[model samples]
Target chain A: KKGLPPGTLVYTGKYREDFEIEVMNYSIEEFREFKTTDVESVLPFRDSSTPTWINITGIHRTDVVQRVGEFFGIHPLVLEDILNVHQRPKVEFFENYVFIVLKMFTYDKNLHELESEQVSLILTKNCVLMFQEKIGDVFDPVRERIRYNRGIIRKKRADYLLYSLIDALVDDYFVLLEKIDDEIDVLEEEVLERPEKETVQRTHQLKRNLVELRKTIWPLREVLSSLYRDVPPLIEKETVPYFRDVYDHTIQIADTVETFRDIVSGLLDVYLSSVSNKTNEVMKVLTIIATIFMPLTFIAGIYGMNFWKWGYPVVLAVMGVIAVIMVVYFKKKK
Target chain B: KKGLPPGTLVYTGKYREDFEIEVMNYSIEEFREFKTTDVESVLPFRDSSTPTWINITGIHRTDVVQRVGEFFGIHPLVLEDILNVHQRPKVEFFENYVFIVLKMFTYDKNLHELESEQVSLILTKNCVLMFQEKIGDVFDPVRERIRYNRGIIRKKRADYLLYSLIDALVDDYFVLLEKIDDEIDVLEEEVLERPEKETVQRTHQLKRNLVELRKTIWPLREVLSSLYRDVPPLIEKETVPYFRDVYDHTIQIADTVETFRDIVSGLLDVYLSSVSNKTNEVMKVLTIIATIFMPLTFIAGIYGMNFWKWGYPVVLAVMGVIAVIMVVYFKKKK
Candidate 1:
């Protein structure tokens, strides 16, 4: 973990030593719930009738990760992608499961900073296994809809449910982009009003953020476009439309990011030009002051020197004359 | 002719003062040609026969321009576009003809400079009339081919012949681009090694050249692509493939022009950064010199100032000590 090759195998997504497995089994008439650390005794995957939503809270434990990987027969590469925190948000299809990885962000109330975590989903025929890097997430809405039977989540297949979760994750990017744009707008206004080093730094930081977003979103375009072109049956026909909508939103995100980068580049030019103008103004003042005083300073130097001194009285008289000439010359130049 | 609208009518292609036209009639074995200044004396169009290549020597004569326009039923806009000496290269569809306007440039052996002329083409059912801004054109290959029954020029319809001419025009751009690229390369080397103000000016001029090329090439892309997509019967089915090839070559031209523009932009940035670095180095020297001398100058003034004699020697010794201390401080810091 300290200095391993970047993609060297950590435990697979499903492998965990002490896994907290929670199963909330639900149907139109009855709802059953189970929570246990013991995976074998927690729920019977073979006999379960109702759709099972198995939530694995902690994925860091090796034993739990190993159990889930073995139970699902997930390919080692797929499992390796799951545990690698640096893996790009992507989807990989396995023998019996579709592994979806997404990056999720939240606004931390205390720190007032945006925090991100990786969420991995393993959707199978009868069961859905959700893995989270942290303990909490934005999946509370999905939980509420499932419990209250409020949405299509109650009747839809696991594939549609996966769409809803991924939809939420993609939609959160829109919110993040909106916040960043708002910050950029404010920064732009401040820069125009009073360009400072901090504003320049903020503009640079915004450009960097846009670059990172571009790296993520540009590839997502290819991924989603490929998905649309090669409509894999694993993604149900109904859910493909949702992915299509996400693709369009991603395009808009790309457009806005590029526009923001252009704006930042323009802003940097404006800042440089404004600094040059200020420096020119400073030089103008210095040149004028020096020109006005140069002759006066020379006259003072000549009389104040020990050579050719006609006395203290002559020196004082000469100084008075020099002062008057300096004032008059400056006034005439003005 | 001297005071006309931007797209005023004038026969820009070659034509004599009295409107001389050469009608080259050719087949596989032999060729017959007739030259006359009178339009009424020319032979009528041959129906579905070997293509006739008509060369108009000068287009400045008003009657020659109008008579040719009438012979082809040229649209008013098309006629005007053909006559405009400075028209950007383009192709347009007319009811009776495919009108193409191009700027042809060739290296002048005498002056070793590039000379450009506007070449216009009107392809009708069995005849192709080429208009040159001046009498002399390096289209001698085409003329020789037509005379000697060479290559596929005699075997194909008038459209292929037109393609050969336009392809020559488009191909000529590659030579021009290469020349421009060579000049830009030399300028870049000068900028990197020793960027004088003239080098910056030349860089700006290179950008302007690309801008000019873009003005010609960008609309030309749409013109050719439209020709490929919306196939006018004036352009034959067989010739469309050849035109498509030409269209692809035009796109490559556009792409190269854009890439050159980007390189120029990067060159401008590098030049500006070099200038900034130079200014920064100069500023460091100035700041160091000012800092070191200001205190010494202040001490010199205090010691040299004429005051009452008491403590004068002590004051001078203190000033000497202060100057030495300031110099030592700067030396240690450096």
Candidate 2:
């Protein structure tokens, strides 16, 4: 991961995975959709008003990733941010285009945590590029909208094409947040009722997830605000509201991350507090046994010589009196 | 504190603490210092090239505070900020003057936490006003400098006077941080060696102190940055470097607060983790005792009837054999 030339391109994902290039060219009057064998097939729709949308799924192949860069003529620096995952999402504006990188997450059920991948987008005047690491995604709904010409996506320019593309992933962040809430809801119950050691275990795991989620989501507010507020060449004024809308959503997500973090921090105290009570309960019972018997047993053994005939009776009377008093005191306290 | 008219002046501090008005007027050539009973005594030095430094200690008297405001012709809102404390320090620029509010802290040796009071400054073109809760403070070093004309503070205008005043407090923050590091060093030993329930207690206390110190210190970076970067009317061009120096100190302070926060957070997990080990140790011993005793006790009771002549010896022999075998197996497993 280090000691390489700064702009060097190397596929750092799975070794055996294949790559797919799916291209879409849509104008007000026509739409062309195809799975191209190579990157050059999309060149025909380069400068149309309703321009090309290129989708690259499974970016584990360096040959295809490098070839696509050659066709688009993107900065080699921009190419590196796509391959190397950034903990925080980043946005870079080029002279001819702009590049945005973000993460898409799914819940890992067996691991009981998050699994995420980097999803990058490059938007130019005449074309929009989207990259993904897997086939299962939230992009399908927007894909159908473009296919049936359901909304203004067909008539708007290429900037709006990327807006719909990026907005889909921002909306998915809310979906991921709901899953996080589900984990917390169940965790809240465990902390209150049966706080085993594993309760703290799950609490710590939840803390790390919220921490990473904040790292990924917090920077996105500045990214979107800069986009719409600055209104760059690639973002249209008419489409500014959509960017602002996404910006507002990221604010909510960032705030919710903080909320979840505070809750998890409180859970550790509750667990430790209850654990202290368990130790107190155990010690109290042991002390009760010792307190009740020590005086009674000591007096009985004091006259074990039985030198006098009445010694046994005297000891019995005294022990009975002491035992009765101690038992009464214990019952009163209870 | 609430339901008052906006911009109202109400002294919300201690009831019986007496207020003092101390005034000092200085030029490169001469200096005059006096403790005045009235606020109007300082008006002779206003609107001059070299200004007066008015030190008001114990601002619990509303009459004196309001009278000083009247003599200076300051806004009522500005007077209220001086009386009411802000959790985060604030800097506000006005057309004629600029107001800055900050907190001064002392270590509460008994409480093992911080004791702080608000310090307010209002810098006009010709006069510098400072407010404090106590006389014992970091201001004495700067006071001596002003009295002896030991440094450039006396030759510079009121802006530099206020800069020297504020820079002393900024320097004191590092002193407070060293005290904070002292607390953490002892706490780190406790977390590792004993890891008692009270270990978590002290950890939580340290957490609250750092949380508050961060709230007080974090906004100061932006406070100083805006002062130097904007270079408002009341601040001098030559003194921008001083403001920038303080801004850099605040950045270091803010980062140290975060570093302390992460360490304290990790302390919780360490305490909780060692606590889990204690539970496991107790449970394992209980299990080993039960494992060895169950078989030996059950066999001894099984043949108590003495149905055969050799029943007593048979039971003894069987119990001894079983105990010997189980003890060997337990030792082997251990």
Candidate 3:
């Protein structure tokens, strides 16, 4: 995979033992879902009036991906993008369809981590194909929407279905953002009140996650805007507004990501300042104790010298004056 | 003023006691400079065949701004944008001209601060009008080039003059970016070698400045690209190439700003990790001292109990064995 050519159809993502392919054919009057490992079974639906959606939930098998691509007449480059899970979020328009690659992220509450997977969508005239890296049910809501004939899912064209899928992915960003917002609030309080080593590490981790999310979400703005403005012939004019709405959502997410980056960066500053402030307090205490003891130690040394001509009262008075002056100076400095 | 309608002609910038307007009318054969407080006096030169450049050094005087807008037939929104010093870098195309608003920044070497001023340029058929917040001579290079008949400035149209002004502003971004890069290098070393409180503060300050610069420079990309692609009629196609050159500069500056931002943010992480490493080292030293002395102090306490049954040799031997064991344990821990 490392030395492969640019447009080679090699699975560059994680390894999986088996892949699953599910096809859902739906129209205004009927609905059906089936599973088949044979790619030839799905070829007949391409010319049918019913809108068909093919979900391939594992792109690590190049053979299956290539078979599906050939059956659907997908370009070699599009198949390459589908197999390369590290591709940036982008949209490419072809003569027959539009290709979009984006990330799907889910939050692990226990570990406080974001897990991302690349999901690619191909929208042809009457068919929509999706490829995912893992066999996860992140798109269950969309599936249910189609299964239950919820809202306009069954009545709309394939482009709207693509819009719904993209919208769902973006909606998850908001959920992740909400979780991050809560974590940030807690971390901000910790930084301001009691900044510890662990707090700094947590802030650093959050910043890294935000950077990764930014890398995934920033280019999505271009993808959405181009889909809306460039008006790819495969996308119906009525569906353009829905894409525009999704574009607006992407903008909001990008803005939030930026603000989170700024805040997380500032948290590091707060932690550093807090640590230094604590160090300063400790140093002040140690200095004051040492300053007071310095003259006392000197006087004790003088007495230890056994000076017979020195009077005890005079020595005590001199030490008292010096201590008083030192105390006054320290207070003035404070 | 708060309830005023959109595009109202009220000035929204800082107050100034006096404002100066300088007009430079130049062409291949002639050049003239004069100062004027009345805006109408500069209007008659607009219809001349030679190119005229009006440099208004202040936008705080609403009456003068209104008169200038009326004389030039400027849009109300354009006037509003000119007086609003906080507007983001943007361009607006009108029927007869194009309005561009951008930020001009100067680096004060003594203070190590970036001073930014909003500059608005209106390019008409035969004239260019520039509105600035201060009388600072950031445009002196361009002015000198025009006055001395250097290069092709004297022969080009007003659109080219507008390009020269924007190109100069974008070039200053490079100068500021170079200064920031040097500061980042210094901060990087300080973070790695010695992460002090002052170093953290400096890093934080530099990051803030970069964020501000990013806020200014990021949108300038869209402004330049749109200007280049849209090619407003006032901007002669002949000068489009010059705008393209400036657009490239803007992109370079943006890329540099983003890189600097990543480095600065990473510096904070390095500083935190360094400080924590130092703390860990100090703690280890103190812990070793305490661990080694614990059993020794216990042995001394037993001796001080004045038990005649305990011999000096036995006490010394016990303390020595305890000290050796503790040292071995600490070594193993390390």
Candidate 4:
């Protein structure tokens, strides 16, 4: 989402049938635009003084995707990675371009749980092309910055733009991790208090979420670290510092995830031990009560039988002695 | 456990009250021992040409231990570690000596498991002094090696003597780990095939044993690694390679213990899951059986009530239809 330079035509994905191309040419005074589906009319923007971003909304159409891929010299592997909706979050640095694929989660319409979708970015020296799996991109901040000529976006090159996009992606991971942490904290408290069947289900759910989160974020550590350590030209010498900052952030996220996992594991043990302690208490109470009643029942059985008893008083006296002796024995053992 | 110079006594902790010091002094042709409670008689053989090993079995007398400690210039910590019956296997390097502690296990008279009393060894320049926690010493190999002149014991220095003792200790650990592994394998198979409440108890026992074993062996890794990496003359330069071999064995044991822990953890999960799966199956059967019979029994109640003769057949037909439909529904669902 940026202003237009000469010779650039914006391409966006086609979730809707009608395709519209909009170009914004920004100079010191005014922002101008030429809107058309025709590619020839936008060639002059390549030589314009202002920076350009050709926002392509739809890339599902094969011919258009290939044409844009060829126009920008985008690698086939990068395009393939972009189209593969299930690709892990990764960064690929090429000779002339940098590619980033990140997953973003949002609360599903049912408001039951979160779901994730892939967002891909290709940053060149001149322009950044982002591919969204579905229509309605949520890069409003980037768009707003470009529209109002705010922040460093107006002065810096496309590499800064790439950093901004990646920063936004990485920040989303923190938000998700924090949300999961809250959920796990509540689950852990519940587990400690009483691990019902639902608590086990919650543990399983948390574990599954952790698995997904790990798959998404763990690789990005290496991806970002490699970016910082080996400075590719496309990731400008100055922008190396910003990527380094993101690398540190990823490390923090990884450590937090690992710690959360450890806490989850410890909570599982606590839940099990607490359940066992409760079971033991139950068994002890039952056994104590049963033992006390067992001899009494035996004595009652003898008295209630058809046999000729010595006398009611004698039976009661014998029972009383047995009960007293048993109580004393139990107390002494305890 | 060597006999070179006559006065050098090795106190392998299991010492008899009446001091029977057997000194086997040999320089390629002579082998002799002066054994007595009187320490003065063995003073003639304390020379540099031949190394000495004194075997002391009992430790009730502090004067004996103190005198030996003084004779060998042993550290107080080494003496304390030696006397502590349950000290974990470890190596401590002092200024002029290296102290090693090992817990050796031997089978009992009933053929049940019996863990040995800790055997502590203090290694110095020309000799090794061992402290026994019992009344009988079992350094027969060292004694036999000198008597028969077998292996490298007669040719190597005090460090090799220490290695021989440690190698014995490691062999005992291997036996223990293997025995536990066999027990775990049997328990795991039983758990998988026909799990009982006793299986859970057995699993818990295995877990507890692992916890104890881990506590014992975990520090030995650090001990051996330190010896291999940094210990000085106590672990001689030539014998360092042998120490590395011991370190590798420790690593294998550690790895096996860890893998067994993981398997045990998974076994617990599988146990719980199997229990839950059975409960679910039982509940499903009960639900289906009850649903089928409940409404039919109500119909039979109405028919059995004899509420007017005309109502009988109609009610019976309705009941039959409902039962058939219910059975069909359950069959399809199943």
Candidate that scores best on lDDT: 3
lDDT by candidate, in order shown? 0.62, 0.70, 0.73, 0.60
The full ranking of all candidates by TM-score, starting with the best, is: 3, 2, 1, 4
Clashes of each: 23, 0, 0, 35
Q: What does candidate 3's lDDT look like per residue over B17-98, in tens digits?
A: 5578888889888889988887777878778889888988878877787887888787554677677665566676556888
Candidate 3 per-residue lDDT, tens place, A1-334, comes to 4645757877777647657889988888899998877777877877768788888888787888888688778888788878888888898978888788988887776365577788989888788888988877556777888788776677777777777777777767777787887776665655656665676666667777888888888898888867865766644435664554456457757866886788565665656556754674565565555565554664464344311476688978878888787678566423
For model 1, what is the C-alpha lDDT against the true structure? 0.62
Docking class of 2: incorrect
Please give the TM-score of chain B in predicted model 1. Answer: 0.75
lDDT of 4 at B53: 59
Root mean square deviation (Cα) for candidate 3: 12.8
lDDT of 2 by residue, A87-106 (tens): 24656654677888888888
What are the per-residue Cα lDDT tens digits for candidate 1 across B3-83?
456655655443334345767767666678877877765536534387777777666766666677776677777777666
Candidate 2 global Cα RMSD: 13.9
Off by over 4 Å in 2: A1-3, A234-237, A303-307, A311-314, A331-334, B1-264, B276-334
Alpha carbon lDDT at A156, candidate 4: 71
Chain B TM, every candidate: 0.75, 0.88, 0.92, 0.77
Tens digits of per-residue lDDT for model 1, A237-268: 67787678878877877787788767765665
**Model 1: DockQ vs. true structure:** 0.02
Return the interface RMSD of the candidates, in order shown, one decimal each. 14.2, 12.4, 10.9, 21.3
lDDT of 1 at A102: 67
Best by TM-score: 3
- What is the DockQ ranking, best to worst? 3, 2, 1, 4
